Design a protein around this ligand. Sequence first.
Ligand code: API
Length: 111
Amino acid sequence: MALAKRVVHFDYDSSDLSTEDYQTLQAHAQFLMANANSKVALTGHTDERGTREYNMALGERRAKAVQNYLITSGVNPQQLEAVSYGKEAPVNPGHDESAWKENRRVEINYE
Ligand SMILES: N[C@H](CCC[C@H](N)C(=O)O)C(=O)O
């Protein structure tokens, strides 16, 4: 079940991971260590609030926060990619809170 989750979320202007996101990440860490040839692309995103520049950096910190946890957990840095899309690729349009909660995220994409 933990492995079924391919996205973790963040609070406003934060790159801190929640206790729930950590459970998810531990599952992927174990899978990646057992599958040394599996590779993952981590994409960081933000909600539409703020400049494009500000959010590109925030998205990058989010992706790297996830990357660093996996690495600390034992995942080979070679199996990981960390990139930011800033506020350019929201999953939910509309300009409201709930929607922004969905957009503050890092997606885990297996190659
Ligand atoms: N200092 C920025 C924070 C934006 C945070 C939001 N884009 C997020 O995705 O967490 C502002 O005044 O909008």
